[PDB]
Amino acid sequence: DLNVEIVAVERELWSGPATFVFTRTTAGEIGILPRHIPLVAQLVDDAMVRVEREGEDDLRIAVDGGFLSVTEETVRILVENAQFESEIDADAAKEDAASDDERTAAWGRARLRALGQ
Template sequence: MAEMSVRLVAVEREVWSGQATFVFARTTIGEIGVLPHHVPLLAELTEAEVVRIDSTEEGEIFAAVHGGFLSVTESGVSILVESAELRDEIDVEQARVDLQSDDEDVRLMAKARLRAAGHEA
């Protein structure tokens, strides 16, 4: 099965990197699925969403991301975001509290965090 190099990088750290067979993300112009040997592209990600990476070693990786870009080149996929949390890093109870925030950005990110953690918002 074909593989590609994928990196998920937030402003403060590299969140995940490795080999994958598929990447799914939501961009400002629609959903995109990236397979190995995809044509090069640059897309802006929606503000608070979930990215899925099908890792060859770890299975499905889910991350809640905020803002950023997805870049596909011959060398692989780079997902560059303002912030990101992997499924096992998400504090589900805090995300549920954040759903009640007066700040719309906090509420949107809370919904993304809950979806990435496998919980309905």
């Protein structure tokens, strides 16, 4: 099973094991299952992450301009700021998605995508 850890710059955000991880890197969409070759990539500005947690349901995360690393030991998602699907404010994300600012608009669109649109 994958050792999936999501590390925000301020703090470590999540550390549960998973069977499958999914995200849109800058050069296309990618999925990682255990024993994937080492990799480094940049998640799209409005990226989202799906972690197929083995025990419970999958975890959908809105990620802000994060980086993805795959290693023989663990799968790391470095994050500037991220939110689990349960913590997303749907109305706030909808409002931000129309924001003029590129960063705010991208973050809101990422929140919408993680939530389930």
